[PDB]
From Swiss-Prot:
Disease per record: Defects in Cacng2 cause the stargazer (stg) phenotype. Stg mice have spike-wave seizures characteristic of absence epilepsy, with accompanying defects in the cerebellum and inner ear.
Residues of the full protein shown: 6 to 208 of 323
Highest classification ranks of the organism: Eukaryota, Metazoa, Chordata, Craniata, Vertebrata
Protein source organism: Mus musculus
Assembly, per entry: The L-type calcium channel is composed of five subunits: alpha-1, alpha-2/delta, beta and gamma. Interacts with the PDZ domains of DLG4/PSD-95 and DLG1/SAP97. May interact with GOPC. Acts as an auxiliary subunit for AMPA-selective glutamate receptors (AMPARs). Found in a complex with GRIA1, GRIA2, GRIA3, GRIA4, CNIH2, CNIH3, CACNG3, CACNG4, CACNG5, CACNG7 and CACNG8. Interacts with GRIA1 and GRIA2. Interacts with MPP2.
Job of this protein: Regulates the trafficking and gating properties of AMPA-selective glutamate receptors (AMPARs). Promotes their targeting to the cell membrane and synapses and modulates their gating properties by slowing their rates of activation, deactivation and desensitization. Does not show subunit-specific AMPA receptor regulation and regulates all AMPAR subunits. Thought to stabilize the calcium channel in an inactivated (closed) state.
Name of the featured protein: Voltage-dependent calcium channel gamma-2 subunit
Length: 172
């Protein structure tokens, strides 16, 4: 009893915090490069030198048919959508405590949490393939992105489970 609403609200906060950190940090890809050759860590927006005379200097990464994947990478729309959709899911499951007995809000939260995970997957694929445009390796903010997807799918499943559980009781 109640554990489902606790676990959903906590999972949604966890997913949102993980994804907002992941999208907002500079540690997606370890690679060689130049910031102004040294080992360099790139996020989504900025690439910063970590092991040399400009240790701690960042430049905005220059992202510029084939044009359109470049544009999708430059905007990173799908990561940001995953944050927006997790926020909307939170503003569903942290609102369903009021206006109780409509039940469609929990389904809307579940649909949001699932579709945000799909958006995270498309974001990951776009990032992995735009970086295909070697010694490289991925960093904690990428793995936090994946963990946000994994938790988002769970909170989605629990939201659909609460939608059904609170539906069947309408029969008494």
């Amino acid at each position: 009893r109640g554990v489902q609403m606790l676990l959903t609200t906590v999972g949604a906060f966890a997913a949102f915090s993980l994804m907002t950190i992941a999208v907002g940090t500079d540690y997606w890809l370890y690679s060689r490069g130049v910031c102004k050759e040294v080992m360099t860590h790139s996020g989504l927006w900025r690439t910063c030198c970590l092991e040399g005379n400009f240790k701690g200097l960042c430049k905005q990464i220059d992202h510029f048919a084939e044009y359109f994947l470049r544009a999708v990478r430059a905007s990173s729309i799908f990561p940001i959508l995953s944050v927006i959709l997790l926020f909307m899911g939170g503003l569903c499951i942290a609102a369903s405590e009021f206006y109780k007995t409509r039940h469609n809000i929990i389904l809307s939260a579940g649909i949001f949490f699932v579709s945000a995970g799909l958006s995270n997957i498309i974001g990951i694929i776009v990032y992995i393939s735009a970086n295909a445009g070697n010694s490289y390796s991925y960093g904690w903010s990428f793995y936090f992105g994946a963990l946000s997807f994994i938790i988002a799918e769970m909170v989605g499943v629990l939201a659909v489970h609460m939608f059904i559980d609170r539906h069947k009781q309408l029969t008494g």
